[PDB]
Amino acid sequence: ASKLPLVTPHTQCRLKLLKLERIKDYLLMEEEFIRNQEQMKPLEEKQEEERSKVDDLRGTPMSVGTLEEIIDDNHAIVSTSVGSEHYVSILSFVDKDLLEPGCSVLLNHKVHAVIGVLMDDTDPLVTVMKVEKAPQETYADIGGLDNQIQEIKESVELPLTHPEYYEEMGIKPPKGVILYGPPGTGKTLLAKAVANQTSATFLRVVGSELIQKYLGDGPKLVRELFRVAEEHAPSIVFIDEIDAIGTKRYDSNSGGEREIQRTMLELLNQLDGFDSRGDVKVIMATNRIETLDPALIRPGRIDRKIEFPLPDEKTKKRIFQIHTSRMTLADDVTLDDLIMAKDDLSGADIKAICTEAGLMALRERRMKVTNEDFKKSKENVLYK
Amino acid sequence: MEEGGRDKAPVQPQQSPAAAPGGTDEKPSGKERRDAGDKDKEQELSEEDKQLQDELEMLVERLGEKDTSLYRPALEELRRQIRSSTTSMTSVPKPLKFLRPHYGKLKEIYENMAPGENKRFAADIISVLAMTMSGERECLKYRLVGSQEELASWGHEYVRHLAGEVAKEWQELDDAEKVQREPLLTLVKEIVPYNMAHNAEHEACDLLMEIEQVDMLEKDIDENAYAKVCLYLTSCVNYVPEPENSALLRCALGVFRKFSRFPEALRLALMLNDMELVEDIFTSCKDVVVQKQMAFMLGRHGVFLELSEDVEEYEDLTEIMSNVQLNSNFLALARELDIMEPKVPDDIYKTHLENNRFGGSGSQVDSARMNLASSFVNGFVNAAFGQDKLLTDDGNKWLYKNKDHGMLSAAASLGMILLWDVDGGLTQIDKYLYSSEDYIKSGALLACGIVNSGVRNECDPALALLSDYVLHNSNTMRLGSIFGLGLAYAGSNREDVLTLLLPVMGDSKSSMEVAGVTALACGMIAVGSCNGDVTSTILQTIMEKSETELKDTYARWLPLGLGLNHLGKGEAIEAILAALEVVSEPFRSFANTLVDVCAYAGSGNVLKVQQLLHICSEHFDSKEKEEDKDKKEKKDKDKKEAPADMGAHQGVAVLGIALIAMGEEIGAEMALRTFGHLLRYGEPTLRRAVPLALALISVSNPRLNILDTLSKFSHDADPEVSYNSIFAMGMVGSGTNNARLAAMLRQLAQYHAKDPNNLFMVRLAQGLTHLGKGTLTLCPYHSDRQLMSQVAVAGLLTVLVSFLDVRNIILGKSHYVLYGLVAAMQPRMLVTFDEELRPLPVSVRVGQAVDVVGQAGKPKTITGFQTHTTPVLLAHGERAELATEEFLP
Amino acid sequence: TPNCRVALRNDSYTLHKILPNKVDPLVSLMMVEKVPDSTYEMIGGLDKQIKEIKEVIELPVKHPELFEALGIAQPKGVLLYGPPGTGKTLLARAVAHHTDCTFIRVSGSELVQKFIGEGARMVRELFVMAREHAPSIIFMDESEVQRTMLELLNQLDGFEATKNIKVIMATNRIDILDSALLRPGRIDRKIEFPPPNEEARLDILKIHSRKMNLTRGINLRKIAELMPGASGA
Amino acid sequence: TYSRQIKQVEDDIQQLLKKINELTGIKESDTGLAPPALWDLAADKQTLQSEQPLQVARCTKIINADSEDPKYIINVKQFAKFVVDLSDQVAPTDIEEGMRVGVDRNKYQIHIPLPPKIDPTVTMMQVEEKPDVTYSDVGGCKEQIEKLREVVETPLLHPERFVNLGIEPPKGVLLFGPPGTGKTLCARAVANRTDACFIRVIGSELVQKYVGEGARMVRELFEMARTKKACLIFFDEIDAIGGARFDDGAGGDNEVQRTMLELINQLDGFDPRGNIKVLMATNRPDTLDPALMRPGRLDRKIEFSLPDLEGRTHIFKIHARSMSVERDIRFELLARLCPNSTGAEIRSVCTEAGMFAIRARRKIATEKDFLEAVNKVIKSYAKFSATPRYMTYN
């Protein structure tokens, strides 16, 4: 039960013999120590006697109150659910430690004295923003990039899995990572691969839903966001499409662009607060890297800037090989004709043509996908 | 299921061993050549430790086991070659041919004959050959033979050499961490007669390796912290010749054979003092070894370096005696006046600030016993050369007011002002000595015995405290004149002034408050010989303690100096010498557990602890032996303090659990002392658990037990953020916890931790876990606080200056001849290396690096850089010579 | 059960009994909205569009393995488009009615808001009720709808593991929506809804003329010729 | 050799820990109670003593007194108001008007005064705790450090050299420059060195939903600032809390301007904060209102510019001291290669240049590793660089 942290001898050596046999000595002494209590203590039982005595102190109508201050000599001002508030005292089975301003407590029904504290069932927004399971397959699903993969493992994964290199180097990891390029080139996809890979708690928020309809609710949402991200452990915060805070204007926003601006001010703090930040990693992505404020883009707030180019054809054929792997491909087709059909197709375009061609197969109930499926498929996808 | 096809090994080893009784008689070639093909194929096809699924080793013995039992025993004409082909094949799978009762019958194949040169088919293979089989030999077979049949037949004589070539086979194959399996052979082989195997592998260990001396060496001290009595007796004297015969590290001798000093042989460490005085190299390691012999773990040595070559290295002994003691002065003279420490810090009484405004008004606490603690505004903060010129007026104007033991207290504070001094400490006493007062003169001359602590020069062999002693017809002109002499000469083994203090015991004077601390003076001097001391104690114990039924003045004081007269050995002879000495009524048999367990300061012999907790556990005790069970609980406070850390969390998971919460008297009255006898280390697992039962007062009991654990709770040194927990307890201590008996005690508690800033390493664990006597000087106060009647009159002789073996704080020290280098240090957490891959990662707290004399802390291990290599002693010892060397381009 | 009413004595607050089952926050929601529940039998001449929508919605519930026979991922997004009054709402209601899925449209209203949360600072809080009625379909009308759909698809692009949840947006004039929504990997199928011809005006007269008290001999062909294709409304 | 013998004898005592730690009583993991071995002294006494004699004493708020008689006027949270009385245990002195007091439920009389309401979202931005940034780490701007530090701490550490000279030291100071220049990092050294209440304020936190709601947070902030002896108030990104009043037609951004005006009135006009020192920090100072730019509020106007050469070399010595490098490199060449750069960018060159050593297999970076850092961070990331339109502060 969290008895001792020194576990380092690791082998059949004798620090373990003397030390594990030392707590073993004090557990023979502990067992025969407590053995005299059940041997020669018939006065009270104390396993439930004094427990039932506490349960006879506290009444059955256990009211739930709220903390707003603390005075140390076991009395404080607590608020009832009505709003009228008291100056009750605090019991001695209330282990004054989980008492913060705003905490849910248990009061008496009669004199409303502080009986116990209450575990919080938590805000649903944490479960809203928390990614639970692994999204999809690994980095082998990606293909073609092979350089920025080393960059992202370099900035995120290798600091996590090997915290030896940076200490023999005498260095800290690079802080901020941003992603940019043309749309549909794998920016979200690589983040799915990282969410597959890591063991840190992973958070994802769309940049569009940063904006609000009430005044200051944006920056309050940012503050409680980084509260949530900090209060866990070594985590990863992902933000997609942060240009959308600057591009579009919506009529739900009661403030103008001079509320969006203040939201960017509070975020601009929360990347680079004077406070000790902690073990929080930030991964950002957009396709309009030129629109936003470069004060958010400076090194110190974002260190590594990673461009995603359009696929060259050699890489394209690899992507065809990926998205046509487990499908019953008829031999009629030639992928090299399908490569140069569009000069600047994205990685999403290939998967769109493959899936839509499979839909053309399931129109005719067949099992293999033929050439004219691709011939009308590129007409369906590309041209409209 | 892919069976058949390649099944040659379940067919031809199924047929030819089956036709081997049909091919032994009347077929002379098929008996032996198929046995040769049964030996090289089972040999070569099982040498590899990657295919542990051999094709015969789990296959042939469905028929080959009964064929073996009808092959080796049922043949009866076993000749000279067919034993080397038979018992080399039938001996390899036999720990897995048989089931778990193989252990009595490893010999029905092997003892017929050990075939030849058994390692020839055990060269490449690590432990699947027979090393597991030889572990099965030494586990059960050598235990049953060598229980009372050590000097024996083939089961010992060849087994020495089999257990020699297998033991060198551990240091033959790889130099892996299977090397450390060899003490698991050398220990489990002949557990009590460990000498005969350590002779068999000590010279093989001499020819083994020099790089394999460091982890084998810490392997042997890695048992030799503590053990069973005979294992600690034999393995520690076998521990010594490894840095002398094989290795030449040769500088960690005295601090690691202080272990091997007391229980083994008192002349063994004297012969190792001779081994110190043989290796006469030059001056660095020779200096550093004999540095620790004065004021780091022992004394009684300053008559042994007067040989015929007194120039500088045999003239080292005076430098050991007082010049590096003057370097311990030079700590606060040069290297603590620069950092923070002013002439009068004074600001902790200033830190008692805002009780005038914490909810109401103030100027209400006007108790006269508050000035007993306001004397420690002068007393506690003036350690480490905080000398005062007309800033002792809080003891001067209280010195002439009332409180006669306070006239003892303010004059007694001057010794705590001038500590580790010889230069002017006798002169700072005389400016307040002359007052014609039996209190002022005995407190101040009692502080004369405090100033010279660790000097043992001409200060008072018979000079000052003999003149203080010879006045006596009355109070302190009798008492305080022996305690400063036992305190000052507590590190000495001089017999003459011990015999000057022998008629103090043999006086049979009615001054019982003097004759009680007479044992607390003479017990502090010697721990070995002079049974006439124990005779003089027990004769007054019979002449005074037998014809009475009174309080703990006898019990807390008279046998405690006998525990200090017989401290520190596991031999269990002294328990016969003293437990059969006061065979008596049980209130005089209070001393049954004194000398029995005071000899057991650090070990593990838990069979002592079952006779420490099963005789008198509680028994509901209707006011009969609660004090004897509080002393039976008092002797639970050793066995724990230096046996290498690992014990604190379960000590608090014992005594924080079932006496203090679910006991009657032993817990609620007494059982908190363990947390001020084991520790002053500091961890939240009990520092945040004792004010859980202490912040509540529980006034039903004799409430100065819980308030007795208030200041004691605050006993913990290495000052911390505990000003919240103690300042809230004294702020509620303003109204509650009434000031008529504890106004000395609350500010005693507040001033105890951070009286100064430094000087707190008093916790009996030096280097790694060496003793350094944190028991003869720390003991009589924790023994002294059991009942009461000593917070006001009698125990004020003890509550001031009880523990005074304060062997400083720090280890950041250069000690070059010029004193020009600073350091190259890097303080961290306690060590993490026992073995890992290669360069054993030492510890994990890389983020800090200093170069100066700065603070120590307990769980710290300090290394460096710059290619300095620390070539002096390397382990620990806080006075590395720190020379440098540059064969590293 | 959590979120259940009880009876309760008052003097000691001892738990007394277990009343009914209250009401699911979604049943209240659809009761507020009151979509005009529909079926295949009130569809006027949209049969090829029915054959389209069966392939995207009907098939990946009854046969999810059938796409694993082809190694392709199941579609998740449907865009419907055409002029108003052309059966979008009854079609999307009808398909969910016949495949037995919880037809949940979002409007962004604030009477809806109290059944979603106290503030529900995202749109994503709907997904608790969605995966609680997990075989369900999300519906949308005609820029806040357009960002809303992006916030849905960015979740079920792979970040949500619960299946059988699909979205449907219906509008007109497909060029004026977002090009990021027009990224070709995003939308799975787009279906045009034309104005009715002389054939498809006739059967809506047939179906919708059922519940009237007629007179024998009507010649609705002439009337469907007289209406030059306004819409189905 | 004793492979299972240490295993099962290890395991039955590691289990036998729990097998009697159930007999202790640590179990029945709670919903908010405490361990059984703790409060055991409020077991029979305070269970009947902190409960059965001890009241509830509901807390209220005073409206006013009246003359010649106590006859106080109370006010409570929702209910009515009363004519109430003292207890005998209180003096009539500290029952001043506008005060919260503890009041019994039956006679409705006053037992103890209370501290006022603090609105603990203001208490959240009290820092309680200090960072670790040393003035050693803020190298390159030594005279800015000195000219700041003489305003910040010298009256607080020595309030006699200003009194015996006979001057009032200045009370307000703002800090401004391009981003990443060391402004926030410079404030962390002040919060490191000081001792008084360091109450931080980030300006975007004051944007509230209601009308005038942020102004009450300003008022409570300066009230608890006035409660202390000396206090330090930190401001950050005050462009959000106000640029200037510009309003026309449809009144926009008014709610920010009312908060900014309340900040003006709390800074000056009718009894000065006294022993309260403020400290602002912005990116662009051009937008700020001139009445806020008036001295008496913003007396010191410390510039943070780019380091000339030697400040840069000193910054290389700061961010480069604690990493395994080739010994015989020079930094002066690198500071020649960085004309216009921030300490953030210099730090990124250091922390990137270590990663170049981590690329292949080495342990100590080289001069050409530094050269691989310079063209990347400066010249490859030179497309954005964030600096030039902030040099003109637009």
Ligand SMILES: Nc1ncnc2c1ncn2[C@@H]1O[C@H](COP(=O)(O)OP(=O)(O)OP(=O)(O)O)[C@@H](O)[C@H]1O
């Ligand atoms: N290099 C690639 N290899 C394989 N698939 C790819 C590649 N690039 C993109 N894709 C496919 O394109 C789809 C869209 O990917 P993703 O959303 O990550 O691109 P994006 O740039 O993030 O898009 P957006 O710009 O809309 O955010 C993915 O499901 C992925 O399967």
Ligand SMILES: Nc1ncnc2c1ncn2[C@@H]1O[C@H](COP(=O)(O)OP(=O)(O)OP(=O)(O)O)[C@@H](O)[C@H]1O
């Ligand atoms: N003189 C300097 N010495 C060392 N490091 C510096 C210096 N100036 C800036 N830096 C580095 O730049 C980073 C940014 O510091 P800081 O947050 O104070 O920037 P700033 O000037 O406040 O601009 P912003 O408002 O954008 O943060 C810090 O992490 C620090 O490491």
Ligand SMILES: Nc1ncnc2c1ncn2[C@@H]1O[C@H](COP(=O)(O)OP(=O)(O)O)[C@@H](O)[C@H]1O
């Ligand atoms: N093919 C059809 N058959 C029957 N009714 C139709 C048809 N098309 C449209 N309607 C009528 O149009 C109305 C629904 O319009 P719809 O297209 O579903 O939504 P919207 O017009 O908002 O896109 C209903 O009242 C329905 O009766």
Ligand SMILES: [Mg+2]
């Ligand atoms: Mg994407």
Ligand SMILES: [Mg+2]
């Ligand atoms: Mg800043």
